Amino acid sequence: SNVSVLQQFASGLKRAKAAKELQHYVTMELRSTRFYDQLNHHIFELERKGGILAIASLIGVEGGNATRIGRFANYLRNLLPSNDPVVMEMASKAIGRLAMAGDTFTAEYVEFEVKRALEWLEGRRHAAVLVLRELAISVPTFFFQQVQPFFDNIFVAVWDPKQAIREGAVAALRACLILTTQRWYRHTFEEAEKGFDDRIHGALLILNELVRISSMEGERLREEMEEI
Amino acid sequence: LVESRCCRDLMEEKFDQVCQWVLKCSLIQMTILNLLPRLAAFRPTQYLQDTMNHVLSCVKKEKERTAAFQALGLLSVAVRSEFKVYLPRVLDIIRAALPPKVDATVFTCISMLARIQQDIKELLEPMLAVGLSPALTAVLYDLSRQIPQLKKDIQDGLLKMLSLVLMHGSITLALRTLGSFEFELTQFVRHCADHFLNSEHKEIRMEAARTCSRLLTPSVSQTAVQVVADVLSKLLVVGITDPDPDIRYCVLASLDERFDAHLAQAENLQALFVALNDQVFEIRELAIC
């Protein structure tokens, strides 16, 4: 039971990874706990894509309510400090998926993550934008606890000399703007105008988000074109 | 509210940046093209002409044709009079671009610009030789449903390409097209019973089973009853003697309630009776129903 699971985890870490995660999730649902935790810890310590995928696959299948939330919280903060390669984006998504399970400690974990991400706001600003977007997508209600500091932090992080950092900041700002519009407009317009007067793509991206939010007529055409 | 108040100023500022940063800044060029469609829809002729010229300049530029193609289509949808005479530049640019064959954005621009009836008459030929892609089929299907100007011409072009494609994985798309939406057919279904009997590809067989049931729509003359009963036999045998259940599962799923009057034949019944004693439950559950 444990030897096969350990062998499958190593094979997935090093389409094979996706197949192993699906098989492990099916096997876990059909059905030991200590062996899975030790294998996950070894995968997380060592590789990076396999450990995050295995944790994400086991999330929402085994049924961890609070015990699994605490263990995943420590692991999630371990990979948050350093912005690893594109594989680490799955780990942030896995953290968001775990935070969206609806646990008692999910509200406290989201608040702690938001405060940590605000300090970070390019291995820190870019990671914070993706983490903030993941939290907003998974828990839009929890992302509205502190929205004023997020806008101020985003207005300063988007001015940094980077290219892909503003891409995540625009997406994070758009997600925050979408949540606000679903239920700050003056601050966003003034901040964009101040930066408008390196500073080319960022200014247009902020303006594009405001235009799409203000008028959704053109957004439907873009969505229809993408689908077709 | 707030955005609608400071909209002309933003449009004026956006126009200045695009006009000034013409060849100075790929990040800004990608952002400028995206921002233009947002400005064109929200703020609708000096602005339109400048935006079209900037899009036209970036249309031939590298790493910007795909962005410009979507931007031009968005502007055309916002105002039909603004792109009434300026659409020919897009058509002329894509006239020799398709015959020469990157092509994914070409179909998207046409689909976005489509949503007057004489330009699509000759434009079908360049699109036909562009290639057999789902985007091309989806765009053509959308044009036919939204604007059925020449339904036969779109049907003739699709049928002609389908006939020659099956004459000799890429073929699976052509089979999908015939079974995707309605067409204007007993010669196809007879040869359609040959692909899954000879091709060893499992993927082509999955679509082969699906298209046979949907293409059997003509279901009191003893000329079509014989042929429909023949093509039904092939699927029934395949659905029980196939190695993997994935092909078998879709065969019986296609044979839905509608074929109640066609599955009652004694020879056909023996095919179904075997499926009750099957190794996997997913087929047994379908067979008993």
Swiss-Prot record, chain A:
Changing residue 100 to T: In a metastatic melanoma sample; somatic mutation. It is found in: Lysosome membrane; Endoplasmic reticulum membrane; Golgi apparatus membrane; Cell membrane. HEAT repeats lie at residues 1-31, 32-64, 65-102, 103-139, 140-180, 182-215. Expressed in numerous tissues, with highest levels in testis. It comes from the Eukaryota. Autophosphorylates when part of mTORC1 or mTORC2. Phosphorylation in the kinase domain modulates the interactions of MTOR with RPTOR and AKT1S1/PRAS40 and leads to increased intrinsic mTORC1 kinase activity. It is linked to Smith-Kingsmore syndrome: An autosomal dominant syndrome characterized by intellectual disability, macrocephaly, seizures, umbilical hernia, and facial dysmorphic features. Part of the mechanistic target of rapamycin complex 1 (mTORC1) which contains MTOR, MLST8 and RPTOR. The mTORC1 complex is a 1 Md obligate dimer of two stoichiometric heterotetramers with overall dimensions of 290 A x 210 A x 135 A. It has a rhomboid shape and a central cavity, the dimeric interfaces are formed by interlocking interactions between the two MTOR and the two RPTOR subunits. The kinase domain (PI3K/PI4K) is intrinsically active but has a highly restricted catalytic center. Belongs to the PI3/PI4-kinase family. Serine/threonine protein kinase which is a central regulator of cellular metabolism, growth and survival in response to hormones, growth factors, nutrients, energy and stress signals. MTOR directly or indirectly regulates the phosphorylation of at least 800 proteins. Functions as part of 2 structurally and functionally distinct signaling complexes mTORC1 and mTORC2 (mTOR complex 1 and 2). This is Serine/threonine-protein kinase mTOR. It comes from Homo sapiens (Human). The gene is MTOR. The chain holds residues 17 to 289 of 2549 of the full protein.
Swiss-Prot record, chain B:
Expressed in numerous tissues, with highest levels in testis. Autophosphorylates when part of mTORC1 or mTORC2. Phosphorylation in the kinase domain modulates the interactions of MTOR with RPTOR and AKT1S1/PRAS40 and leads to increased intrinsic mTORC1 kinase activity. HEAT repeats lie at residues 10-44, 45-80, 81-115, 116-148, 185-219, 220-259, 262-289. Changing residue 210 to H: In FCORD2; uncertain significance; somatic mutation. It is found in: Lysosome membrane; Endoplasmic reticulum membrane; Golgi apparatus membrane; Cell membrane. Belongs to the PI3/PI4-kinase family. Serine/threonine protein kinase which is a central regulator of cellular metabolism, growth and survival in response to hormones, growth factors, nutrients, energy and stress signals. MTOR directly or indirectly regulates the phosphorylation of at least 800 proteins. Functions as part of 2 structurally and functionally distinct signaling complexes mTORC1 and mTORC2 (mTOR complex 1 and 2). Part of the mechanistic target of rapamycin complex 1 (mTORC1) which contains MTOR, MLST8 and RPTOR. The mTORC1 complex is a 1 Md obligate dimer of two stoichiometric heterotetramers with overall dimensions of 290 A x 210 A x 135 A. It has a rhomboid shape and a central cavity, the dimeric interfaces are formed by interlocking interactions between the two MTOR and the two RPTOR subunits. This is Serine/threonine-protein kinase mTOR. The chain holds residues 356 to 713 of 2549 of the full protein.
